[PDB]
Structures are given as C-alpha cells and as structure tokens.
Amino acid sequence: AQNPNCNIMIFHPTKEEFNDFDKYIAYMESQGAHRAGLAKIIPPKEWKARETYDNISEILIATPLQQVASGRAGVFTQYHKKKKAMTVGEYRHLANSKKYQTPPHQNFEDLERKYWKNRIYNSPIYGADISGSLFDENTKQWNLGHLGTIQDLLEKECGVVIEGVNTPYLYFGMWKTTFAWHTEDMDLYSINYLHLGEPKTWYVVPPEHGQRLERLARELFPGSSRGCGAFLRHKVALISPTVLKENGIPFNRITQEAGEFMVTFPYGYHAGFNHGFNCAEAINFATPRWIDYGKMASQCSCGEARVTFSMDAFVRILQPERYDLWKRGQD
Numbered sequence: 559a560q561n562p563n564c565n566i567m568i569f570h571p572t573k574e575e576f577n578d579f580d581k582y583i584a585y586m587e588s589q590g591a592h593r594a595g596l597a598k599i600i601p602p603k604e605w606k607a608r609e610t611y612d613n614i615s616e617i618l619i620a621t622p623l624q625q626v627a628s629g630r631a632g633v634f635t636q637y638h639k640k641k642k643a644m645t646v647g648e649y650r651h652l653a654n655s656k657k658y659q660t661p662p663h664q665n666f667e668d669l670e671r672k673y674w675k676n677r678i679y680n681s682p683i684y685g686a687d688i689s690g691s692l693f694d695e696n697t698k699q700w701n702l703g704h705l706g707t708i709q710d711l712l713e714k715e716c717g718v719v720i721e722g723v724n725t726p727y728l729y730f731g732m733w734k735t736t737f738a739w740h741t742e743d744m745d746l747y748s749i750n751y752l753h754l755g756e757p758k759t760w761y762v763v764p765p766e767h768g769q770r771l772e773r774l775a776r777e778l779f780p781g782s783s784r785g786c787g788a789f790l791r792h793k794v795a796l797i798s799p800t801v802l803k804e805n806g807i808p809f810n811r812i813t814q815e816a817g818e819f820m821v822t823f824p825y826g827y828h829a830g831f832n833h834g835f836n837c838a839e840a841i842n843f844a845t846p847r848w849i850d851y852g853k854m855a856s857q858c859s860c861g862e863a864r865v866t867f868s869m870d871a872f873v874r875i876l877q878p879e880r881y882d883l884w885k886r887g888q889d
C-alpha cells in the first residue's frame with residue numbers, strides 16, 4: 559500500500575507530464591497521494607497561468623464577508639457578515655491597512671502560532687466565492703476554467719446525461735481570513751491555484767480517518783450537532799492543531815505559496831487561513847474513483863448548507879433515497 563502514513567505528497571511534473579490532467583491525477587493516486595487528503599503540485603518552470611497580474615484591480619467583490627468568531631481560541635465558529643461591495647484594488651488597500659495587515663513575524667511557524675492565539679479577537683474580511691477565472695485563455699495546461707466537467711464525468715461513468723455546469727471561483731484573502739473544516743460538496747475533489755500574494759496554510763485529515771474528525775466535532779459543538787446530522791457542511795467550525803493533537807485526531811499541515819496548486823481528494827477534510835493579501839482560484843472536479851464517494855456522501859437537510867444548482871442532479875442520480883429530504887432542505 560503506497561503512502562501508508564498518509565503524508566502530504568509534493569509533485570514536480572515536467573512540462574510533458576503537465577499536458578494530460580486526468581492522467582497526472584491518476585499517477586498521483588498510484589503513488590498514494592490521496593491517502594493524505596491533500597497534495598501539492600509545483601508547475602514546471604516553463605509554465606505560467608497568465609502574463610501578469612497588473613490589471614486585476616477593477617474586478618468587483620460584490621459581497622465581501624466579515625468573518626466574526628465565537629468561542630475559544632482553539633474551538634470556535636465563524637459567521638459571515640455581508641459588507642458593501644468593493645473592487646479588488648480597494649480590498650488590497652484595506653488588507654494592507656494597519657487594522658488588517660499581517661504582523662511582523664519570524665517564519666511561517668511563528669505566524670501560525672499568532673494565528674491560533676489571536677484569530678478570534680479580530681474579524682477579517684474575505685472576498686470569497688466570486689465566479690470567474692484569472693487563467694489566460696491561451697494557457698492550455700492545468701487551466702481551471704478548461705477542465706472536463708463533473709456532469710460529463712457522471713455521464714461517461716454511469717451513462718445518464720444531466721443538467722448543470724461547473725465553473726471556477728476566485729478568492730481574495732487577507733491576514734487571518736479563514737476556511738472552516740469541510741469536505742467538498744458531494745465529497746468531490748477540489749483544485750486550488752494560488753495566483754498571487756501571500757501564502758495559505760492548510761490542515762487536512764486523511765479520508766480514511768474523516769469520521770474521527772466528525773465525532774470530535776459533535777463533542778465540541780454539541781448544539782450544532784443536535785441541529786443537523788451533517789453540520790460540518792455548514793462550513794462554520796474551526797478546531798486548532800493543538801486541540802486535534804490533544805484528541806488524537808490524525809492530520810497534516812502544509813503551506814501553499816503563490817504559483818502552486820493544491821488538490822483535495824474525496825472526503826479529505828480540510829481547513830486553513832491566509833497569511834496576507836492573496837488571490838486564489840478553485841474548482842471542483844471528479845474522476846472515476848469519486849463515484850463511490852459521491853454515493854456515500856453525507857448531506858445537510860436542515861436548510862443551512864444551501865448549495866449550487868448543479869448539486870441537484872448529483873443527489874438525484876447517486877442518492878435517490880435521500881433526494882426528497884435533501885430537496886426540502888434546499889426549499
């Protein structure tokens with residue numbers, strides 16, 4: 559069995575290996591990368607996503623989200639308070655202001671300590687989930703706006719044509735902006751490219767150990783757990799590495815820098831935070847190995863999780879028994 563300790567693997571594909579996306583994901587899996595839940599891919603030196611980032615300031619962040627925390631430093635929830643629209647140039651200036659800028663620090667580890675110690679006492683503003691792409695149309699390799707669609711994968715595997723589309727999302731972050739513990743919708747893969755700016759630190763639980771995280775979360779968030787049998791689908795709960803270690807939950811951590819891809823694998827719980835102003839792009843995707851995870855994915859039906867149009871068909875075809883209840887939660 560490859561990668562039996564479930565370590566995060568880092569890959570350095572050549573330009574020739576960077577041509578065929580599906581083949582390279584399958585190669586990574588042949589080496590056990592999926593066992594960690596997360597892998598890093600450093601593009602060949604010849605590759606670029608686009609020529610420059612000098613002309614992105616006029617992108618609009620229609621609904622910036624202020625991430626307000628409740629709880630204790632290592633065990634907290636966050637809610638998103640909607641703010642007035644601002645451009646990327648306005649957001650960058652705000653991120654660099656004295657109120658919001660990254661503090662002085664020695665190294666990534668010192669910054670991580672400061673994050674966990676101090677996050678709850680501040681409310682950073684995240685430009686998340688913005689439909690669009692920063693890949694040049696002429697970039698042919700690993701262009702997240704040109705991937706094979708999940709609807710086409712389900713059709714290829716299972717023979718059923720379904721409605722829906724699959725497009726990327728941009729994330730503009732600042733110091734302390736936070737992504738809560740979650741798996742992807744329908745336990746899909748995700749791929750994330752950090753276009754520019756400061757790093758993003760990730761934490762991940764191996765898929766084979768995901769239920770350990772869920773059980774801890776039910777213990778630590780007992781009101782939430784009574785409200786919903788899949789409340790991590792709400793994407794609001796944070797648990798620190800120190801707390802995970804005290805409770806014996808297997809996990810790993812890694813920092814992504816500008817120019818690097820991360821892939822999350824089916825049912826790989828992940829969480830993390832941004833170091834300072836940055837821009838990432840991400841999209842969900844599927845492979846043949848995903849289908850069995852999609853069939854078994856938990857679902858939120860309490861009404862909180864509210865998701866895209868395209869998840870309808872995945873539930874309807876892969877989870878017909880659950881469909882009626884799940885759709886009530888959507889309506």
Ligand SMILES: O=C(O)CNC(=O)C(=O)O
Pocket residue numbers: 729736737748749750822828838840841
């Ligand atoms: O970058 C973020 O805020 C969150 N990203 C992801 O959860 C991902 O790419 O799967």
Ligand SMILES: [Mg+2]
Pocket residue numbers: 613614615616617
């Ligand atoms: Mg612009």
Ligand code: NI
Pocket residue numbers: 740741742748822828
């Ligand atoms: Ni994710």
Ligand SMILES: [Zn+2]
Pocket residue numbers: 785786787788789791792858859860861862863
């Ligand atoms: Zn719910």
